[PDB]
Amino acid sequence: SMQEEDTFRELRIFLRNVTHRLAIDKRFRVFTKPVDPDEVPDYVTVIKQPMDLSSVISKIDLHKYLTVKDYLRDIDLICSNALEYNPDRDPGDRLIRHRACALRDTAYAIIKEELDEDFEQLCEEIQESR
Numbered sequence: 332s333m334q335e336e337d338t339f340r341e342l343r344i345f346l347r348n349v350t351h352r353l354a355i356d357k358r359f360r361v362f363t364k365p366v367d368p369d370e371v372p373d374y375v376t377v378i379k380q381p382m383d384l385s386s387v388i389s390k391i392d393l394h395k396y397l398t399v400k401d402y403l404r405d406i407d408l409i410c411s412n413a414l415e416y417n418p419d420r421d422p423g424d425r426l427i428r429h430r431a432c433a434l435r436d437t438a439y440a441i442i443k444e445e446l447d448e449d450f451e452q453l454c455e456e457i458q459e460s461r
């Protein structure tokens with residue numbers, strides 16, 4: 332309905348705002364764009380399902396997220412991909428893992444602080460009725 336398309340538009344506006352706040356944070360620059368095979372050859376062969384914040388923004392604009400949980404699944408994938416690709420004790424690996432955990436925790440804390448829980452439930456219920 333018109334009331335339902337209004338709800339999904341508000342969700343997209345909200346998810347764009349959260350994603351932008353993540354993307355301008357200097358800690359998360361490694362997560363803002365896809366990994367260049369020129370510069371990281373092993374990546375596209377260790378990580379079967381790439382994800383980054385530019386790809387999240389494109390999915391929002393393609394109406395691919397109908398619930399906050401669907402969005403957080405791709406945030407969780409950015410983080411779990413980073414932990415999986417950087418398992419070593421090397422300080423470079425520990426640094427990326429630290430930032431990956433901070434990206435995940437920051438997204439969750441923004442949602443917990445600023446999203447109404449009745450709003451997420453409305454999104455769920457509209458979606459389960461389709």
Ligand SMILES: CC(=O)c1csc(NC(=O)[C@H]2CNCCN2CCC2CCC(F)(F)CC2)n1
Nearest residue numbers: 361362366371412413416417421423424426427
């Ligand atoms: C998207 C993703 O998960 C990803 C992309 S490259 C990668 N990690 C690396 O290539 C690790 C591998 N082991 C050796 C050290 N490397 C670089 C660490 C160094 C940390 C600071 C920095 F600013 F990030 C530059 C990179 N991970």
